[PDB]
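Escalated from tier 1: chloride ion holo job.
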Amino acid sequence: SALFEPYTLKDVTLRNRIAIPPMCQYMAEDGLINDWHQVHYASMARGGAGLLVVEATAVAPEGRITPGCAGIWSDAHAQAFVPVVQAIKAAGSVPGIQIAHAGRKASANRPWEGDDHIGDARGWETIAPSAIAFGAHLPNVPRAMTLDDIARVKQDFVDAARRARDAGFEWIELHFAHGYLGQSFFSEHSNKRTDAYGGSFDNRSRFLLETLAAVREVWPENLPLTARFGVLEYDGRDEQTLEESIELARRFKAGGLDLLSVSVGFTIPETNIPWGPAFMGPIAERVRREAKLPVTSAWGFGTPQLAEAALQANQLDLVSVGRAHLADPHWAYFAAKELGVEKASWTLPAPYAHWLE
Amino acid sequence: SALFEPYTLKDVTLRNRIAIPPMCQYMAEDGLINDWHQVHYASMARGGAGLLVVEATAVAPEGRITPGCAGIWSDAHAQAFVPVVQAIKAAGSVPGIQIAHAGRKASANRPWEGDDHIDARGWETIAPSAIAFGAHLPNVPRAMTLDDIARVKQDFVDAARRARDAGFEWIELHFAHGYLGQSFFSEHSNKRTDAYGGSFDNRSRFLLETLAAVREVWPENLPLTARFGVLEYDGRDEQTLEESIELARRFKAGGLDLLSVSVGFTIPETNIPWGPAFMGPIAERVRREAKLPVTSAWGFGTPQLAEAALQANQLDLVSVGRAHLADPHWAYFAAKELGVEKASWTLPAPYAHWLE
Ligand SMILES: Cc1cc2nc3c(=O)[nH]c(=O)nc-3n(C[C@H](O)[C@H](O)[C@H](O)COP(=O)(O)O)c2cc1C
Ligand SMILES: Cc1cc2nc3c(=O)[nH]c(=O)nc-3n(C[C@H](O)[C@H](O)[C@H](O)COP(=O)(O)O)c2cc1C
Ligand SMILES: C=C(C(=O)O)c1ccccc1
Ligand SMILES: C=C(C(=O)O)c1ccccc1
Ligand SMILES: [Cl-]
Ligand SMILES: [Cl-]
Ligand SMILES: [Cl-]
Ligand SMILES: [Cl-]
Ligand SMILES: [Cl-]
Ligand SMILES: [Cl-]
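Tier 2 regenerated the structure:
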């Protein structure tokens, strides 16, 4: 079963091709994680997945999506992640983390408490390339960033990467997708700047390439440096947007990116996304083949046969399974059993495996 | 769905009828639990089960089944349970614990390391009589004196007291599966001629005296339960079952709040008819004749089987063990499988919102 093939990238070996993608828990307070996250991540790690990417972690307080989002903007925040790393490693899984800045989609309520912008002593001004609201349920207009804002946020990403390294993460992912800060710099929908960071393809790519280059300097060369990146919007410009996105991926690769998590942009709400099980499969394959970068992707791979089929077709190097690990922390064990893998129960630690054969 | 109906017993209310039975993890060190147990228990509790009974916890070092078994024979051992209790409560589940003495079946290797009598890690075992279990447990126990019986009863009391102070809201005496209490009740293993063997009253005495002693420190408003093997499948089933139900009646008169109905496993010469929910009709008969609430286990991981046993009034609580090892969130799976409305809110909000 290709799903249960190990995977080596730089000095890191994953015991199988199942990755748990980042999924915010909306349970931290002032960015500090707690007992919720500890049990949550240690449990999925024991489930058998080879890689576990911790949820989107803000590099700065205004970079949080919500007041419940994890943060790593101070050394105290970094230290709280230390026992999460040790517990993921102790389970045999690889700890990774996604560091993020929500840009103009920040200052929002938790999804089960409105899922929209905060009107309210809990709100904060947001920043983005240009002062243009997302629209829909995020109508707050962001402040357009100055050159000093750009230098500061890049340094936040560097500090977040450095803290992540020192906490023991072995895998880092820059959040350049889903309409957040990095994504909003790349898209013409959101970036109307006329300085060095807007207009041309080179200028729109600049924020992302510079942030990657700064992180490359503190992130160890022997540990995978990856990014999640929205390569099309389904906005009626997909062939053009896909071509630019793949070219940027080529510049990511020249800049030391080791793997790309292929996603959708979500930069604006006026879209027609063709949701379906594994619908990203063919987009990720094209990115993998044209930019010659390993990839992962997500959405609907919780059906084990779909995950297997995506790997055997070389559309993916890793399969990311999110909501299914929320439903079942031990989904990897379910998948090994579902795919007839030999000694499927030994995907779990011995206190479970011995009794489930 | 009756499986997702709350249940009240003394001052404790369970949010549904799903109980996680005690399941030893073989991951403790000299009886001390650690980060393995903390995440193991907090995760299953977040899965939605209403009651979570912590694994068999030794009241004394020689009462461990294996060297990886939890213990509660000191205050340091009890304090280690505090964060497990608190995490179970924080998830909305009820923490219980099974306190135990393995008797003549102790000093054994972990199931994945031989599963047989133990080597510098072994120890002398005690039992009513100096008679080995047999099979892969051939070490002969030391027969207990009256002073031994007084010691072990006080161990159960001290364990109950520690359990209370750690915050458990539900206690289970392990009088099943061939361990010390079970071996005192069975004629197969109890050949004593003093006040603790021979007649039915004498064979019951240790169990009734341990229960009464535990009752003195265990709060009256928190469920006091026991797990008890009511038959052996040893060719003496109607006689054994009738005696076992009689003892259950005396347990009830002695303050037992619920009975976890199991098989004795006192000797190896048996023909147990394993099958899905096979204990159902045994538990129903005990429930009806002893007029006590009951739970039972073995094969209720099929949600429809759990629902059927509750609707038939064979059980008050359904114990689901191995399915919660495979899937810590089994309660949510059972809710979805049985068409329960807002099934995803069996889980906490960070999960429930996304599974609607
Ligand atoms: C609760 C939840 C939180 C999410 N948080 C993040 C996040 O922190 N970062 C991210 O890039 N994607 C996030 N996602 C998207 C997932 O990583 C993934 O792309 C998506 O769930 C599709 O995979 P699935 O079908 O296996 O769930 C989130 C999804 C869910 C359900
Ligand atoms: C790993 C494991 C450990 C167990 N440990 C205990 C224990 O500590 N005490 C006990 O009385 N029963 C113990 N049992 C029995 C379970 O409580 C339960 O009755 C049995 O597994 C049947 O239920 P199930 O079919 O849902 O797993 C254990 C079973 C397993 C598989
Ligand atoms: C943080 C998220 C992201 O990266 O878009 C997210 C959060 C909830 C659902 C989907 C995605
Ligand atoms: C401690 C146990 C018991 O109560 O007999 C146990 C341990 C392993 C498997 C079944 C049961
Ligand atoms: Cl564009
Ligand atoms: Cl490649
Ligand atoms: Cl399963
Ligand atoms: Cl008998
Ligand atoms: Cl009754
Ligand atoms: Cl499920």
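Residues A 355; B 21-24, 55-56, 98, 174, 176-177, 227, 297-301, 319-323 surround flavin mononucleotide (ligand 2) (CB under 6 Å).
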